[PDB]
Amino acid sequence: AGRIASFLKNAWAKEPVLVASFAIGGLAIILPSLSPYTNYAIRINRATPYNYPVPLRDDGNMPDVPSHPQDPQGPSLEWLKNL
């Protein structure tokens, strides 16, 4: 405890550069997991369409996908509009 705190204090005095790099470098590894927006970040990347949403043939029994790009059914992203 006392040795550890003194070693930090001796570091912070002898060198302020690597401790600052080690500190902010250390954080850059941990909070990405704890962040509650990282699952949102992948959703944003998934939302952005670079290729065409190629249509698929109808054979019945397909309620999920819409028949028109205005129908209420289908994947909607009003979460991202407010976000």
Q: With respect to another protein, which residue has the nearer C-beta, 9 or 46?
A: 9
Total of residues contacting another protein (CB under 8 A)? 6
Residues 6+ apart with CB under 8 A from 77: 47
- Identify the residue among 2, 3, 4, 17 touching another protein (CB under 8 A): 17
Q: What are phi and psi of 62, to 5 degrees?
A: -130, 70
* Minimum distance from residue 7 beta carbon to another protein (Å): 13
Three-state DSSP at 26 gives: helix
- Identify the residue among 3, 4, 7, 13 touching another protein (CB under 8 A): 13
